[PDB]
């Protein structure tokens, strides 16, 4: 009927309008999601980079700590060498003083006994034997003194060398520690950037829009099905 043409026609125009509005909304949603997915591409590449760099930094940190431990074990060996050397020095200096004194003593004894041989000159032969014995003893005392003095000089030298090497090691350790502090800063900055990247990657509005787009598309489908029935009605009326 004419009246049914009018009524169904009014229904048709309403359906067309509502479909137009729903498809408008749906396109907007699709655009927004099309920006989110791009942001996730960018962020996921940066995240991959940053966790890589973070691995590199942690490896460098461990290696630096290991080099420091090696340097400090070497430092402790050298400290023990120095303490061992230093504990010998009072004894060596005592020996040297006593040997200088013994040397002077023997020289004076040789002078006195030579004086008696001078004054007397039968049993001066005994004094002459005593003389050669005093000469052997003085000679030995002098050779011992040379040996003690040389050994004290050698111990002092070896102490100085160990101390210089220890200073060297402390400078190496200071350099490593400076690098470790720089790496701890780099790691803190990387960890923070990485946590922000993860948080952006759990945003999670991407799914908030995927489900909503599913719904609005379902409703568009429903409206188009009613529209198709209404059209088929008007096309046979």
Residue numbers in the entry: 345 to 465, 696 to 811
What is written in the article reporting this PDB entry?
Multi-subunit SMC complexes control chromosome superstructure and promote chromosome disjunction, conceivably by actively translocating along DNA double helices. The heads undergo ATP-dependent engagement and disengagement to drive SMC action on the chromosome. Here, we elucidate the architecture of prokaryotic Smc dimers by high-throughput cysteine cross-linking and crystallography.
To do so, we first determined the structure of the upper region of the Py Smc coiled coil, designated as PySmcCC3, comprising residues 345–468 and 694–814 connected via a SGGS linker. The structure refined to 2 Å resolution showed that, while the N-terminal α helix is continuous, the C-terminal helix contains a short non-helical region. In addition, the N-terminal helix bends noticeably at residue P434, which is unlikely to bear functional importance since P434 is not a conserved residue.
